[PDB]
Design a protein around this ligand. Structure first.
Ligand SMILES: [Zn+2]
Length: 32
């Protein structure tokens, strides 16, 4: 599945199949 969903958020570990999916999570998650 690290083949199918090779990208991951460094804070929560959520896995993503595509970079734009992670990009959106990264932009808006885990903020004050
Ligand atoms: Zn995260």
């Amino acid at each position: 599945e690290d083949r199918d969903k090779p990208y991951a958020c460094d804070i929560c570990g959520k896995r993503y199949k595509n970079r734009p999916g992670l990009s959106y999570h990264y932009a808006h998650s885990h903020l004050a």
